[PDB]
Amino acid sequence: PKEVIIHKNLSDALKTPNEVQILDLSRNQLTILPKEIEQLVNLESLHLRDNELTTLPEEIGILKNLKYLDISRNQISNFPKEIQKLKNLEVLFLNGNSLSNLPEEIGELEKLGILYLNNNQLTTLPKEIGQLENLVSLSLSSNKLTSIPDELGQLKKLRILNLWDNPTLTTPERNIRKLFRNQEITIEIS
Ligand SMILES: [Cl-]
Ligand SMILES: [Zn+2]
Ligand SMILES: [Zn+2]
Ligand SMILES: [Zn+2]
Ligand SMILES: [Zn+2]
Ligand SMILES: [Zn+2]
Ligand SMILES: [Zn+2]
């Protein structure tokens, strides 16, 4: 049973916490996500787009059923290690944030299939990015990339790698393509 009338208010969601499948707090001028989010144990989708967040509380790791997390258009610069507990996460929108580095824990999102990192200030990816075995689409457009780790070549299900608008990346196109020599993939390099 899917939720079609989604929840848009945290206080109301907390009145019947086991009931809530989708919570949308986008454009709520949040500077912090309240710790009480951990009460929504059955949450599957959390939208926090266009807030003023700089991180997530460590309580996020209690949301083990989460499949979709939209934190786009915030000022996110770091994550708690507890993000590694989001083992059911399939889609992560991190576009439009303040990321200059991704933590090693990003590589622990075992079921992640789609990762959007457009419009951040990343200079590289951690070696642990190669642990995302189910990743199909990785978008890194408009970042500050200077290198791509060889471990990216471990992503055998990757079908789209988008590197548009990274003029700082001096890495030759042939070297990038060589990481995925045999594999079915389209690589977008400006
Ligand atoms: Cl949203
Ligand atoms: Zn309700
Ligand atoms: Zn959203
Ligand atoms: Zn922690
Ligand atoms: Zn699924
Ligand atoms: Zn095909
Ligand atoms: Zn193209």
Coordinates of N, CA and C and ligand atoms in Angstrom, one line a residue:
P1 N 0.8 -1.2 0.0 CA 0.0 0.0 0.0 C 0.8 1.3 0.0
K2 N 0.7 2.1 -1.1 CA 1.5 3.3 -1.2 C 0.7 4.5 -0.7
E3 N 1.4 5.5 -0.2 CA 0.8 6.7 0.3 C 0.7 7.7 -0.9
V4 N -0.5 8.2 -1.1 CA -0.9 9.2 -2.2 C -1.1 10.6 -1.6
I5 N -1.6 10.7 -0.4 CA -1.8 11.9 0.3 C -0.7 12.0 1.3
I6 N 0.4 12.7 0.9 CA 1.6 12.7 1.7 C 1.6 13.6 2.9
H7 N 2.5 13.4 3.8 CA 2.6 14.2 5.0 C 3.4 15.4 4.8
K8 N 3.0 16.6 5.1 CA 3.7 17.8 4.9 C 4.0 18.6 6.2
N9 N 3.6 18.0 7.3 CA 3.9 18.6 8.6 C 4.4 17.7 9.6
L10 N 5.6 18.0 10.2 CA 6.2 17.0 11.1 C 5.4 16.8 12.4
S11 N 4.9 18.0 13.0 CA 4.1 17.8 14.2 C 2.9 16.9 14.0
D12 N 2.1 17.0 12.9 CA 1.0 16.2 12.6 C 1.5 14.7 12.4
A13 N 2.6 14.5 11.7 CA 3.2 13.2 11.4 C 3.5 12.5 12.7
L14 N 4.0 13.2 13.7 CA 4.4 12.7 15.0 C 3.2 12.2 15.8
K15 N 2.0 12.6 15.4 CA 0.7 12.1 16.1 C 0.5 10.6 15.8
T16 N 0.9 10.1 14.7 CA 0.7 8.7 14.3 C 2.0 8.3 13.6
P17 N 3.1 8.2 14.3 CA 4.4 8.1 13.7 C 4.6 6.8 12.8
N18 N 4.0 5.7 13.2 CA 4.2 4.5 12.4 C 3.5 4.4 11.0
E19 N 2.5 5.3 10.8 CA 1.7 5.5 9.7 C 2.4 6.2 8.5
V20 N 3.3 7.1 8.8 CA 3.9 8.0 7.8 C 4.9 7.3 6.9
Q21 N 4.6 7.4 5.6 CA 5.5 6.8 4.6 C 6.3 7.8 3.8
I22 N 5.7 9.0 3.6 CA 6.3 10.1 2.8 C 6.2 11.4 3.6
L23 N 7.3 12.0 3.9 CA 7.3 13.3 4.6 C 7.9 14.3 3.7
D24 N 7.3 15.5 3.4 CA 7.8 16.5 2.6 C 7.8 17.8 3.4
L25 N 9.0 18.2 3.8 CA 9.3 19.4 4.5 C 10.1 20.3 3.6
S26 N 9.9 20.2 2.3 CA 10.6 21.1 1.4 C 10.1 22.6 1.6
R27 N 11.0 23.6 1.4 CA 10.7 25.0 1.6 C 10.0 25.3 2.9
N28 N 10.6 24.7 4.0 CA 10.1 25.0 5.3 C 11.0 25.9 6.1
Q29 N 12.0 26.5 5.4 CA 13.1 27.3 6.1 C 13.7 26.7 7.3
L30 N 14.0 25.4 7.1 CA 14.6 24.6 8.2 C 16.1 24.9 8.2
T31 N 16.7 25.2 9.4 CA 18.1 25.3 9.6 C 18.7 24.0 10.1
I32 N 17.8 23.2 10.7 CA 18.1 21.9 11.3 C 16.9 21.0 11.1
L33 N 17.2 19.7 10.9 CA 16.1 18.7 10.9 C 15.9 18.2 12.3
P34 N 14.7 18.4 12.9 CA 14.5 17.9 14.3 C 14.9 16.5 14.5
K35 N 15.4 16.2 15.7 CA 15.8 14.8 16.1 C 14.6 13.9 16.1
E36 N 13.4 14.4 16.3 CA 12.1 13.7 16.5 C 11.8 12.9 15.2
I37 N 12.5 13.3 14.0 CA 12.4 12.5 12.8 C 12.6 11.0 13.1
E38 N 13.4 10.6 14.1 CA 13.6 9.2 14.3 C 12.4 8.4 14.7
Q39 N 11.3 9.1 15.1 CA 10.1 8.4 15.4 C 9.3 7.9 14.2
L40 N 9.7 8.3 13.0 CA 9.0 7.9 11.8 C 9.6 6.7 11.2
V41 N 9.5 5.6 12.0 CA 10.3 4.4 11.7 C 10.0 3.8 10.4
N42 N 8.8 4.0 9.8 CA 8.4 3.4 8.5 C 8.6 4.3 7.4
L43 N 9.2 5.4 7.6 CA 9.4 6.4 6.5 C 10.1 5.8 5.3
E44 N 9.6 6.0 4.1 CA 10.2 5.6 2.9 C 10.7 6.7 2.0
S45 N 10.2 7.9 2.2 CA 10.6 9.0 1.4 C 10.7 10.3 2.2
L46 N 11.8 11.0 2.1 CA 11.9 12.2 2.9 C 12.4 13.3 1.9
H47 N 11.6 14.4 1.8 CA 11.9 15.5 1.0 C 12.2 16.7 1.8
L48 N 13.4 17.3 1.6 CA 13.9 18.5 2.4 C 14.5 19.5 1.5
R49 N 14.0 19.5 0.2 CA 14.5 20.4 -0.8 C 14.3 21.9 -0.4
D50 N 15.3 22.8 -0.7 CA 15.2 24.2 -0.6 C 14.9 24.6 0.8
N51 N 15.8 24.2 1.7 CA 15.8 24.6 3.1 C 17.2 25.2 3.3
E52 N 17.6 25.4 4.6 CA 18.9 26.0 5.0 C 19.7 25.0 5.8
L53 N 19.6 23.7 5.4 CA 20.3 22.7 6.2 C 21.8 22.7 5.9
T54 N 22.6 22.4 6.9 CA 24.1 22.2 6.7 C 24.5 20.8 6.9
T55 N 23.7 20.0 7.5 CA 24.0 18.6 7.8 C 22.7 17.9 8.1
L56 N 22.7 16.6 8.5 CA 21.6 15.8 8.9 C 21.9 15.4 10.4
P57 N 20.8 15.2 11.2 CA 21.1 14.7 12.6 C 21.5 13.2 12.5
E58 N 22.3 12.8 13.5 CA 22.7 11.4 13.6 C 21.5 10.5 13.7
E59 N 20.3 11.0 14.1 CA 19.0 10.3 14.2 C 18.6 9.8 12.8
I60 N 19.1 10.3 11.7 CA 18.7 9.9 10.4 C 18.9 8.4 10.2
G61 N 19.9 7.8 10.8 CA 20.3 6.4 10.7 C 19.2 5.5 11.2
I62 N 18.2 6.0 12.0 CA 17.1 5.1 12.5 C 16.1 4.8 11.3
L63 N 16.2 5.7 10.3 CA 15.2 5.6 9.2 C 15.6 4.5 8.2
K64 N 15.8 3.2 8.7 CA 16.3 2.1 7.9 C 15.5 1.7 6.7
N65 N 14.2 2.1 6.7 CA 13.3 1.8 5.5 C 13.3 2.9 4.4
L66 N 14.1 3.9 4.6 CA 14.1 5.0 3.7 C 14.6 4.6 2.3
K67 N 13.9 4.9 1.3 CA 14.2 4.5 -0.1 C 14.6 5.8 -0.9
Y68 N 14.1 6.9 -0.5 CA 14.3 8.1 -1.3 C 14.6 9.3 -0.4
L69 N 15.7 10.0 -0.7 CA 16.1 11.2 0.2 C 16.4 12.3 -0.7
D70 N 15.7 13.4 -0.6 CA 15.9 14.6 -1.4 C 16.3 15.7 -0.5
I71 N 17.6 16.0 -0.6 CA 18.2 17.1 0.2 C 18.8 18.2 -0.7
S72 N 18.2 18.3 -1.9 CA 18.6 19.3 -2.9 C 18.4 20.7 -2.4
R73 N 19.2 21.6 -2.9 CA 19.1 23.0 -2.7 C 19.1 23.4 -1.2
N74 N 20.2 22.9 -0.5 CA 20.4 23.3 0.9 C 21.8 23.8 0.9
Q75 N 22.5 23.8 2.1 CA 23.9 24.2 2.2 C 24.6 23.1 2.9
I76 N 24.3 21.8 2.5 CA 24.9 20.6 3.1 C 26.4 20.6 2.8
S77 N 27.2 20.5 3.9 CA 28.6 20.3 3.7 C 29.2 19.0 4.3
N78 N 28.4 18.4 5.1 CA 28.9 17.1 5.8 C 27.7 16.3 6.2
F79 N 28.0 15.0 6.6 CA 27.0 14.1 7.0 C 27.5 13.4 8.2
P80 N 26.6 12.9 9.1 CA 27.0 12.0 10.2 C 27.3 10.6 9.7
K81 N 28.1 9.9 10.4 CA 28.4 8.5 10.0 C 27.2 7.6 9.8
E82 N 26.1 8.0 10.6 CA 24.9 7.2 10.6 C 24.2 7.1 9.3
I83 N 24.6 7.9 8.3 CA 24.0 7.7 7.0 C 24.3 6.3 6.4
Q84 N 25.4 5.7 6.9 CA 25.7 4.3 6.4 C 24.6 3.3 6.7
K85 N 23.7 3.6 7.7 CA 22.6 2.7 8.0 C 21.4 2.7 7.0
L86 N 21.5 3.7 6.0 CA 20.4 3.8 5.0 C 20.6 2.8 3.9
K87 N 20.5 1.5 4.3 CA 20.8 0.4 3.4 C 19.7 0.1 2.4
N88 N 18.6 0.8 2.5 CA 17.5 0.6 1.6 C 17.4 1.8 0.7
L89 N 18.3 2.8 0.8 CA 18.2 4.0 0.0 C 18.5 3.7 -1.5
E90 N 17.6 4.1 -2.4 CA 17.7 3.9 -3.8 C 18.0 5.1 -4.6
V91 N 17.6 6.3 -4.1 CA 17.7 7.6 -4.8 C 18.2 8.6 -3.8
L92 N 19.2 9.4 -4.2 CA 19.7 10.4 -3.3 C 19.9 11.7 -4.1
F93 N 19.2 12.7 -3.8 CA 19.3 14.0 -4.5 C 20.1 14.9 -3.6
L94 N 21.4 15.3 -4.0 CA 22.2 16.1 -3.2 C 22.6 17.3 -4.1
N95 N 21.9 17.6 -5.2 CA 22.3 18.7 -6.0 C 22.1 20.0 -5.4
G96 N 22.9 21.0 -5.7 CA 22.7 22.3 -5.1 C 23.0 22.4 -3.7
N97 N 24.3 22.0 -3.3 CA 24.6 22.1 -1.9 C 26.1 22.6 -1.7
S98 N 26.7 22.5 -0.6 CA 28.0 23.0 -0.3 C 29.0 21.9 0.0
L99 N 28.9 20.8 -0.8 CA 29.8 19.7 -0.6 C 31.2 19.9 -1.3
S100 N 32.3 19.9 -0.6 CA 33.6 20.0 -1.2 C 34.2 18.6 -1.2
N101 N 33.7 17.7 -0.3 CA 34.1 16.3 -0.2 C 33.0 15.4 0.2
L102 N 33.0 14.1 -0.2 CA 32.0 13.2 0.1 C 32.6 12.2 1.2
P103 N 31.9 11.9 2.3 CA 32.6 11.0 3.2 C 32.6 9.5 2.7
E104 N 33.5 8.7 3.3 CA 33.6 7.3 3.0 C 32.3 6.6 3.1
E105 N 31.4 7.0 4.0 CA 30.1 6.4 4.3 C 29.1 6.4 3.1
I106 N 29.4 7.3 2.2 CA 28.6 7.3 1.0 C 28.6 5.9 0.3
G107 N 29.8 5.3 0.3 CA 30.0 4.0 -0.3 C 29.2 2.9 0.4
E108 N 28.6 3.1 1.6 CA 27.9 2.1 2.3 C 26.4 2.0 1.9
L109 N 26.0 2.8 1.0 CA 24.5 2.9 0.6 C 24.4 1.7 -0.5
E110 N 24.3 0.5 0.0 CA 24.3 -0.7 -0.8 C 23.3 -0.7 -2.0
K111 N 22.1 -0.2 -1.8 CA 21.1 -0.3 -2.8 C 21.0 1.0 -3.7
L112 N 21.9 1.9 -3.5 CA 21.8 3.2 -4.2 C 21.9 3.0 -5.7
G113 N 20.9 3.5 -6.4 CA 20.9 3.4 -7.8 C 21.1 4.7 -8.5
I114 N 20.7 5.8 -7.9 CA 20.7 7.1 -8.6 C 21.3 8.1 -7.6
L115 N 22.4 8.8 -8.0 CA 23.0 9.8 -7.1 C 23.3 11.1 -7.9
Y116 N 22.6 12.1 -7.4 CA 22.7 13.4 -8.1 C 23.6 14.3 -7.2
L117 N 24.7 14.8 -7.7 CA 25.6 15.6 -7.0 C 25.9 16.9 -7.8
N118 N 25.0 17.2 -8.7 CA 25.2 18.4 -9.6 C 25.3 19.7 -8.7
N119 N 26.1 20.7 -9.1 CA 26.1 22.0 -8.4 C 26.5 21.9 -7.0
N120 N 27.7 21.3 -6.8 CA 28.4 21.2 -5.5 C 29.8 21.7 -5.8
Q121 N 30.8 21.6 -4.9 CA 32.1 22.1 -5.1 C 33.1 20.9 -5.0
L122 N 32.7 19.7 -5.4 CA 33.6 18.5 -5.2 C 34.8 18.6 -6.1
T123 N 35.9 18.2 -5.5 CA 37.2 18.2 -6.2 C 37.6 16.8 -6.6
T124 N 37.0 15.8 -6.0 CA 37.1 14.4 -6.3 C 36.1 13.6 -5.6
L125 N 36.2 12.3 -5.8 CA 35.3 11.3 -5.1 C 36.1 10.4 -4.3
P126 N 35.6 10.0 -3.1 CA 36.4 9.1 -2.3 C 36.5 7.7 -3.0
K127 N 37.6 7.0 -2.6 CA 37.8 5.6 -3.2 C 36.6 4.7 -3.0
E128 N 35.9 4.9 -1.8 CA 34.8 4.1 -1.4 C 33.6 4.3 -2.3
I129 N 33.6 5.2 -3.3 CA 32.5 5.4 -4.3 C 32.4 4.1 -5.1
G130 N 33.5 3.4 -5.3 CA 33.5 2.1 -6.1 C 32.7 1.0 -5.4
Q131 N 32.3 1.2 -4.1 CA 31.5 0.2 -3.4 C 30.0 0.2 -3.8
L132 N 29.6 1.2 -4.5 CA 28.1 1.4 -4.9 C 27.8 0.5 -6.0
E133 N 27.7 -0.8 -5.8 CA 27.5 -1.8 -6.8 C 26.2 -1.7 -7.6
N134 N 25.2 -1.1 -7.0 CA 23.9 -0.9 -7.7 C 23.7 0.4 -8.4
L135 N 24.8 1.3 -8.4 CA 24.7 2.6 -9.0 C 24.5 2.5 -10.5
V136 N 23.5 3.2 -11.1 CA 23.1 3.2 -12.5 C 23.4 4.6 -13.1
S137 N 23.2 5.6 -12.2 CA 23.4 7.0 -12.8 C 24.1 7.8 -11.7
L138 N 25.2 8.5 -12.2 CA 26.0 9.3 -11.3 C 26.1 10.7 -12.0
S139 N 25.6 11.7 -11.4 CA 25.6 13.0 -12.0 C 26.5 14.0 -11.2
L140 N 27.6 14.5 -11.8 CA 28.6 15.3 -11.1 C 28.7 16.6 -11.9
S141 N 27.7 17.0 -12.6 CA 27.9 18.2 -13.4 C 28.0 19.5 -12.6
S142 N 28.8 20.5 -13.1 CA 29.0 21.7 -12.3 C 29.5 21.5 -10.9
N143 N 30.7 20.9 -10.9 CA 31.5 20.7 -9.6 C 32.8 21.3 -9.9
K144 N 33.8 21.0 -9.1 CA 35.2 21.6 -9.2 C 36.2 20.4 -9.3
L145 N 35.8 19.4 -10.1 CA 36.6 18.1 -10.2 C 37.9 18.3 -10.7
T146 N 38.9 17.7 -10.1 CA 40.3 17.8 -10.6 C 40.8 16.4 -10.9
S147 N 40.2 15.3 -10.3 CA 40.5 14.0 -10.5 C 39.3 13.1 -10.3
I148 N 39.3 11.9 -10.9 CA 38.3 10.9 -10.8 C 39.1 9.6 -10.2
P149 N 38.6 8.9 -9.1 CA 39.4 7.8 -8.7 C 39.2 6.6 -9.6
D150 N 40.3 5.7 -9.7 CA 40.2 4.5 -10.6 C 39.1 3.6 -10.1
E151 N 38.8 3.6 -8.8 CA 37.7 2.8 -8.2 C 36.3 3.0 -8.8
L152 N 36.2 4.2 -9.5 CA 34.9 4.4 -10.2 C 34.6 3.3 -11.3
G153 N 35.7 2.8 -11.8 CA 35.6 1.7 -12.8 C 35.0 0.4 -12.2
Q154 N 34.9 0.3 -10.8 CA 34.3 -0.9 -10.2 C 32.8 -0.8 -10.3
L155 N 32.2 0.3 -10.7 CA 30.7 0.5 -10.8 C 30.2 -0.1 -12.1
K156 N 30.1 -1.5 -12.1 CA 29.7 -2.2 -13.3 C 28.3 -2.0 -13.8
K157 N 27.4 -1.5 -13.0 CA 26.0 -1.3 -13.5 C 25.8 0.2 -13.9
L158 N 26.9 1.0 -13.8 CA 26.8 2.4 -14.1 C 26.5 2.6 -15.6
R159 N 25.4 3.3 -16.0 CA 25.0 3.5 -17.3 C 25.2 4.9 -17.8
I160 N 25.2 5.9 -16.9 CA 25.4 7.3 -17.2 C 26.3 7.9 -16.2
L161 N 27.4 8.5 -16.7 CA 28.3 9.2 -15.8 C 28.3 10.7 -16.4
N162 N 27.8 11.6 -15.6 CA 27.7 13.0 -16.2 C 28.7 13.9 -15.5
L163 N 29.7 14.4 -16.3 CA 30.8 15.2 -15.8 C 30.7 16.6 -16.5
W164 N 29.5 17.0 -17.0 CA 29.5 18.3 -17.7 C 29.9 19.4 -16.8
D165 N 30.4 20.5 -17.4 CA 30.8 21.7 -16.6 C 31.8 21.4 -15.5
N166 N 32.8 20.7 -15.7 CA 34.0 20.5 -14.8 C 35.2 20.9 -15.6
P167 N 35.4 22.2 -15.9 CA 36.5 22.6 -16.7 C 37.9 22.5 -16.0
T168 N 37.8 22.3 -14.6 CA 39.0 22.1 -13.8 C 39.5 20.6 -13.9
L169 N 38.8 19.7 -14.5 CA 39.2 18.3 -14.7 C 40.1 18.3 -15.9
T170 N 41.4 18.1 -15.6 CA 42.5 18.0 -16.7 C 42.7 16.6 -17.1
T171 N 42.1 15.6 -16.4 CA 42.1 14.2 -16.7 C 41.7 13.9 -18.2
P172 N 42.5 13.4 -19.1 CA 42.1 13.1 -20.4 C 40.9 12.2 -20.5
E173 N 40.0 12.5 -21.5 CA 38.8 11.8 -21.8 C 39.1 10.3 -21.9
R174 N 40.1 9.9 -22.7 CA 40.5 8.5 -23.0 C 40.7 7.8 -21.7
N175 N 41.4 8.4 -20.7 CA 41.7 7.8 -19.4 C 40.4 7.4 -18.6
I176 N 39.4 8.3 -18.6 CA 38.1 8.2 -18.0 C 37.4 7.0 -18.7
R177 N 37.3 7.0 -20.0 CA 36.6 6.0 -20.8 C 37.3 4.6 -20.6
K178 N 38.7 4.6 -20.4 CA 39.4 3.4 -20.2 C 39.0 2.7 -18.9
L179 N 38.5 3.4 -17.9 CA 38.1 2.8 -16.6 C 36.9 1.9 -16.9
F180 N 36.1 2.2 -17.9 CA 34.8 1.4 -18.2 C 34.9 0.8 -19.6
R181 N 36.2 0.4 -20.0 CA 36.5 -0.1 -21.3 C 35.4 -1.0 -22.0
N182 N 35.0 -2.1 -21.4 CA 34.0 -3.0 -22.1 C 32.6 -2.6 -21.9
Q183 N 32.3 -2.2 -20.6 CA 31.0 -1.8 -20.1 C 30.1 -0.9 -21.0
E184 N 28.8 -1.2 -20.9 CA 27.7 -0.4 -21.6 C 27.5 0.9 -20.7
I185 N 27.9 2.1 -21.2 CA 27.8 3.3 -20.5 C 27.9 4.5 -21.5
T186 N 27.3 5.6 -21.1 CA 27.5 6.8 -21.8 C 28.2 7.8 -20.8
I187 N 29.2 8.4 -21.3 CA 30.0 9.3 -20.5 C 29.8 10.7 -21.1
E188 N 29.4 11.7 -20.2 CA 29.2 13.0 -20.7 C 30.3 13.9 -20.1
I189 N 31.2 14.4 -21.0 CA 32.3 15.3 -20.6 C 32.3 16.5 -21.5
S190 N 32.3 17.7 -20.9 CA 32.2 19.0 -21.7 C 33.6 19.2 -22.3
Ligands
CL1 CL 10.6 18.1 -2.8
ZN2 ZN -1.3 11.0 8.4
ZN3 ZN 11.7 16.3 -3.3
ZN4 ZN 27.4 9.6 14.7
ZN5 ZN 13.0 -0.8 -4.4
ZN6 ZN 21.4 -1.7 -23.8
ZN7 ZN 27.3 14.5 -24.9

